[PDB]
Amino acid sequence: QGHMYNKTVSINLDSRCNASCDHCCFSSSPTSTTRMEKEYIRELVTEFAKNKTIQVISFTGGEVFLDYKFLKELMEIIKPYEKQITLISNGFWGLSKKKVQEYFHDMNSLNVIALTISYDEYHAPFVKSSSIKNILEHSRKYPDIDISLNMAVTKDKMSNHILEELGDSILGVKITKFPMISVGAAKTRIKQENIHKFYSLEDEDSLHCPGYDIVYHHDGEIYPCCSPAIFETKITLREEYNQSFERTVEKLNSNLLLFILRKEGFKWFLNILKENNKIEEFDIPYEFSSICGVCGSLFNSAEKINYFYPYMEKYYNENF
Amino acid sequence: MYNKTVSINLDSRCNASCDHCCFSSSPTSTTRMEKEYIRELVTEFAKNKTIQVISFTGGEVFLDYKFLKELMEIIKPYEKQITLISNGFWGLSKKKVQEYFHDMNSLNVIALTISYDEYHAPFVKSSSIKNILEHSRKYPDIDISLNMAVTKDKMSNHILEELGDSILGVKITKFPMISVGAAKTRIKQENIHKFYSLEDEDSLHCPGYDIVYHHDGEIYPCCSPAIFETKITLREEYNQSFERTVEKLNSNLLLFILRKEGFKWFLNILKENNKIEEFDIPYEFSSICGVCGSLFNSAEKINYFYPYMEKYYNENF
Ligand SMILES: Nc1ncnc2c1ncn2[C@@H]1O[C@H](CSCC[C@H](N)C(=O)O)[C@@H](O)[C@H]1O
Ligand SMILES: Nc1ncnc2c1ncn2[C@@H]1O[C@H](CSCC[C@H](N)C(=O)O)[C@@H](O)[C@H]1O
Ligand code: SF4
Ligand code: SF4
Ligand code: SF4
Ligand code: SF4
């Protein structure tokens, strides 16, 4: 009956990227300076590799293959401990058939179980279609590596032609088209009318958090999930510079707000706001692109989080 | 090993008559296990302590929804997880869609795969698929996938574009045809993508075993369309327990050699004996399973390997 959320961890290596996507939740670019120091990352990876509960370590950015020597070094620290690795990339490195062969050999040797390639109309000005095809076609030689294609779309950029132009390189590839979260470059460079809004406050029984997944982010913070929407809230997991993963897990499992959110869903909070006529005061959007859209507006201020304190206190007293 | 999941193929009858169908399913297909026998199998899998997931397939499982719901209700007190695969014909009615999603959510259905492509399109309307995909947003605990069977002449590019934003958040997988069932005779072999060949011994390994109690009354070691035309059965008698099925899978010599040595062990025997042409092994194929089908689709072909498997067992262990 122990702690949860300690089987996986993600590390965001850098905000620097070869691309400058108009939707990028991190506003990544070749001149982005936000990152944890390399030695600090080596210490985190070493701890995650030695950790008794972590099975999967995931890397993200930014573009993790941009400084491949560093990525390979981190994968090599993990190797003797035999933990599984997941990578996500824009596939710019697909331009070189030599880098494609070499990187797939490294990933297969370093227990990389999944590689996600992001490609769509927002990525297209920075990466050639043929680079994506080279990666997808070569991955057929590495069946143990699960390959996914993630396409970020809007009403004006649905990536219909992009997919058709990839031809048969996508056969056997898990494709997922998803809507934008209005965060980072998407807030200012994309018209809110082009972002799909599928969910509404009327879908109260369907409003449930997709799940917690710890992220040691490139801004030096630790977040409870991988959603772009979490950065705008006041829900963090870091209390000091030298923090162990055991402490990170302990803080997450003992967070009362995150416990009630998991057990009761967003309806518990929304129903308190409706009964107290504070939905408009809290600026809760009627419609949203994802469940995380409510999360942002419910907890984007210390006062909003503090509003729920007497109700959370009452809930703990009643059920504990 | 291989005892955490099980699949049951409820019927070969289907509302559709897809030109690629590995079972050649149609509304006039008569092949199926009896209903009472299926009730007994489901009851046994529900009571089994090791099985976590029970999957249903056909045919079209929603065609006789009353029987599907009855089977899901037998499992319910035992709290096993269920997976369903469907052509989504039932998507025509939004009211029907809400009802089935409510049942699915109450009956621990963790995954629903919808099959849609140019082969399915003459039998199911695009708007039916959209209704299912859009309503699934209300059930985040049900994992939704879209499986599209394609050829060089039917890549389902328009099909996907016509689904619009209903596919947002849906795992889409386009895959090539296995030359089995209706695809063998109704599709030109030049339109089936051939990614693999006998030369690349790498990637000539079985993806893995998954027990299926099929609509022909046999038991298969995997869910691949290719296996249903082989003579590899795990059934020895009418009333056979899942423990016996697992025991037979774990002690099957041909499947042990296939798992450890890969398809190269069998192909090298045929090449060495100049029987590749005699056995009709395709030089090029869409998937690894394409070799499996041609290696073992007759008792004569399977029996050929027996003295070699006997030699292998004597040499090893
Ligand atoms: N505002 C936003 N809303 C939704 N997804 C976004 C987003 N900003 C970025 N993403 C997606 O988040 C993923 C990780 S971004 C960092 C990894 C890498 N450079 C890449 O592009 O894969 C990508 O699939 C990207 O398209
Ligand atoms: N010859 C073949 N090659 C490859 N996939 C095939 C096939 N025959 C059938 N399939 C696929 O196998 C899956 C299960 S068929 C039975 C389930 C249901 N009627 C359906 O269509 O989903 C479907 O996705 C179908 O497209
Ligand atoms: S979405 Fe990925 S590739 Fe595009 S700018 Fe952001 S980090 Fe770079
Ligand atoms: S609902 Fe909130 S905590 Fe859950 S994934 Fe979305 S942003 Fe993160
Ligand atoms: S592929 Fe599925 S929907 Fe099409 S005929 Fe076969 S069983 Fe029926
Ligand atoms: S058809 Fe053969 S190779 Fe394919 S999954 Fe079944 S047993 Fe494995």
Curated annotation (Swiss-Prot), chain A:
Keywords, sorted A to Z: 4Fe-4S, Iron, Iron-sulfur, Metal-binding, S-adenosyl-L-methionine
UniProt keyword annotation of 4Fe-4S present: yes
Binding site for [4Fe-4S] cluster: C17, C21, C24
Cofactor dependence: [4Fe-4S] cluster
Keyword Iron-sulfur recorded: yes
GO molecular function ontology, one term from the record: catalytic activity
Domain Radical SAM core: 4-217
Signal sequence interval, chain numbering: none
InterPro entries referenced in this protein's UniProt entry, alphabetically: Aldolase_TIM, Pep_rSAM_mat_YydG, Radical_SAM_PqqE_MftC-like, rSAM
Co-factor note (free text): Binds 1 [4Fe-4S] cluster. The cluster is coordinated with 3 cysteines and an exchangeable S-adenosyl-L-methionine.
Pfam family, one: Fer4_12
Function summary: Required for production of the modified peptide YydF. May activate a metalloenzyme (Potential).
Record protein name field: Putative peptide biosynthesis protein YydG
Lineage: Bacteria, Bacillati, Bacillota, Bacilli, Bacillales
